[PDB]
Enzyme design. Structure first.
Site, PDB file in Angstrom:
ATOM      1  N   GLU A  65       0.843  -1.187   0.000  1.00  0.00           N
ATOM      2  CA  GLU A  65       0.000   0.000   0.000  1.00  0.00           C
ATOM      3  C   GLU A  65       0.880   1.239   0.000  1.00  0.00           C
ATOM      4  OE1 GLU A  65      -4.339   1.274   1.193  1.00  0.00           O
ATOM      5  OE2 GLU A  65      -3.332  -0.001  -0.275  1.00  0.00           O
ATOM      6  N   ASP A  93      -1.927  -5.275   1.348  1.00  0.00           N
ATOM      7  CA  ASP A  93      -1.216  -4.106   1.861  1.00  0.00           C
ATOM      8  C   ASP A  93       0.236  -4.370   2.236  1.00  0.00           C
ATOM      9  OD1 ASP A  93      -3.452  -2.513   1.530  1.00  0.00           O
ATOM     10  OD2 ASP A  93      -4.164  -2.835   3.579  1.00  0.00           O
ATOM     11  N   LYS A 119     -14.597  -8.341   4.892  1.00  0.00           N
ATOM     12  CA  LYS A 119     -13.263  -8.399   4.302  1.00  0.00           C
ATOM     13  C   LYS A 119     -12.886  -9.828   3.927  1.00  0.00           C
TER      14      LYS A 119
HETATM   15  O1  LIG Z   1      -6.034  -1.166  -0.933  1.00  0.00           O
HETATM   16  C1  LIG Z   1      -7.222  -0.848  -0.966  1.00  0.00           C
HETATM   17  N1  LIG Z   1      -7.845  -0.441  -2.069  1.00  0.00           N
HETATM   18  C2  LIG Z   1      -7.172  -0.444  -3.366  1.00  0.00           C
HETATM   19  C3  LIG Z   1      -7.992   0.230  -4.439  1.00  0.00           C
HETATM   20  C4  LIG Z   1      -9.304  -0.468  -4.708  1.00  0.00           C
HETATM   21  C5  LIG Z   1     -10.388   0.234  -5.214  1.00  0.00           C
HETATM   22  C6  LIG Z   1     -11.592  -0.406  -5.465  1.00  0.00           C
HETATM   23  C7  LIG Z   1     -11.724  -1.751  -5.217  1.00  0.00           C
HETATM   24  C8  LIG Z   1     -10.660  -2.460  -4.718  1.00  0.00           C
HETATM   25  C9  LIG Z   1      -9.454  -1.825  -4.468  1.00  0.00           C
HETATM   26  C10 LIG Z   1      -8.074  -0.904   0.277  1.00  0.00           C
HETATM   27  N2  LIG Z   1      -9.362  -0.554   0.151  1.00  0.00           N
HETATM   28  C11 LIG Z   1     -10.153  -0.576   1.227  1.00  0.00           C
HETATM   29  C12 LIG Z   1     -11.603  -0.189   1.034  1.00  0.00           C
HETATM   30  C13 LIG Z   1     -12.566  -1.386   1.002  1.00  0.00           C
HETATM   31  C14 LIG Z   1     -12.406  -1.880  -0.427  1.00  0.00           C
HETATM   32  C15 LIG Z   1     -12.478  -0.587  -1.209  1.00  0.00           C
HETATM   33  N3  LIG Z   1     -11.840   0.380  -0.306  1.00  0.00           N
HETATM   34  C16 LIG Z   1     -11.491   1.636  -0.632  1.00  0.00           C
HETATM   35  O2  LIG Z   1     -11.037   2.400   0.217  1.00  0.00           O
HETATM   36  C17 LIG Z   1     -11.675   2.064  -2.071  1.00  0.00           C
HETATM   37  O3  LIG Z   1     -11.240   3.399  -2.308  1.00  0.00           O
HETATM   38  C18 LIG Z   1      -9.902   3.653  -2.351  1.00  0.00           C
HETATM   39  C19 LIG Z   1      -8.895   2.730  -2.073  1.00  0.00           C
HETATM   40  C20 LIG Z   1      -7.564   3.103  -2.150  1.00  0.00           C
HETATM   41  C21 LIG Z   1      -7.213   4.384  -2.514  1.00  0.00           C
HETATM   42  C22 LIG Z   1      -8.186   5.308  -2.799  1.00  0.00           C
HETATM   43  C23 LIG Z   1      -9.519   4.942  -2.719  1.00  0.00           C
HETATM   44 CL1  LIG Z   1     -10.746   6.120  -3.082  1.00  0.00          CL
HETATM   45  N4  LIG Z   1      -9.667  -0.960   2.448  1.00  0.00           N
HETATM   46  C24 LIG Z   1      -8.349  -1.328   2.611  1.00  0.00           C
HETATM   47  O4  LIG Z   1      -7.939  -1.670   3.729  1.00  0.00           O
HETATM   48  C25 LIG Z   1      -7.546  -1.287   1.473  1.00  0.00           C
HETATM   49  O5  LIG Z   1      -6.267  -1.645   1.649  1.00  0.00           O
HETATM   50 MN   LIG Z   2      -6.016  -2.634   3.775  1.00  0.00          MN
HETATM   51 MN   LIG Z   3      -4.708  -1.735   0.469  1.00  0.00          MN
END
Ligand SMILES: O=C(NCCc1ccccc1)c1nc([C@@H]2CCCN2C(=O)COc2ccccc2Cl)[nH]c(=O)c1O
Ligand SMILES: [Mn+2]
Ligand SMILES: [Mn+2]
Length: 179
Positions: A65, A93, A119
């Site tokens: 991440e 991550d 999750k």
């Molecule tokens: O890496 C994660 N997301 C990667 C991107 C993504 C985007 C869409 C789908 C799947 C994956 C992640 N996402 C999350 C949470 C729950 C799953 C979606 N979500 C978000 O926050 C989505 O939006 C973002 C995520 C990252 C940056 C900016 C935004 Cl806007 N919770 C984490 O713990 C985690 O590590």
């Molecule tokens: Mn995460």
């Molecule tokens: Mn992540």
């Protein structure tokens, strides 16, 4: 429009974290000036990820991440090819070189059990799951909390400090009712 939550995030998290969070949000098509609660959430999650990778030995954790999507997957492919671990369906991550598993960190405002279920159901079996909450609860796969107690306690303390700083500014209620 300049929100209080945006200005609070900027004075609460260090600039590298804020910068990385802004680039991630724009990379996925959202605005930190509008989606200000998620701005805070991503900064929080980023700082937890970094504190976690600091909890092990020197070369224990690879950090996934905080990278752009292409190079994060590039590192995943390299990890998968030299260790022989299944390529996860979704971006994790961290990677634990000591236990040889991908880790998905979670930071939730609701009760821990639910978030772990969502999750776990959403994520792929091999990836280890570790959830933190803003109330000090945590849950890990097979009750295996990867780090020793002091490193996870430090993460818990910071998360509760963030909650307090928002509550002092009357921003906590909007944050909790936003996830
Ligand atoms: O890496 C994660 N997301 C990667 C991107 C993504 C985007 C869409 C789908 C799947 C994956 C992640 N996402 C999350 C949470 C729950 C799953 C979606 N979500 C978000 O926050 C989505 O939006 C973002 C995520 C990252 C940056 C900016 C935004 Cl806007 N919770 C984490 O713990 C985690 O590590
Ligand atoms: Mn995460
Ligand atoms: Mn992540």
């Amino acid at each position: 429009r300049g929100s209080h939550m945006e200005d609070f995030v900027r004075q609460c998290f260090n600039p590298m974290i804020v910068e990385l969070a802004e680039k991630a949000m724009k990379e996925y098509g959202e605005d930190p000036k509008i989606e200000t609660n998620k701005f805070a959430a991503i900064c929080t999650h980023l700082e937890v990820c970094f504190m976690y990778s600091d909890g092990g030995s020197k070369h224990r954790f690879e950090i996934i991440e905080g990278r752009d999507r292409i190079m994060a997957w590039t590192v995943v492919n390299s990890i998968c090819n030299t260790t022989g671990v299944e390529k996860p369906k979704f971006l994790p991550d961290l990677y634990d070189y000591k236990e040889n598993r991908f880790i998905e960190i979670g930071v939730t405002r609701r009760e821990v059990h639910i978030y772990y279920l969502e999750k776990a159901n959403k994520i792929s079996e091999k990836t280890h799951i570790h959830i933190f909450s803003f109330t000090g609860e945590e849950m890990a796969t097979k009750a295996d909390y990867t780090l020793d107690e002091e490193s996870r306690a430090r993460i818990k303390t910071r998360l509760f400090t963030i909650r307090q700083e928002m509550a002092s500014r009357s921003l906590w209620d909007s944050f909790r009712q936003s996830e």
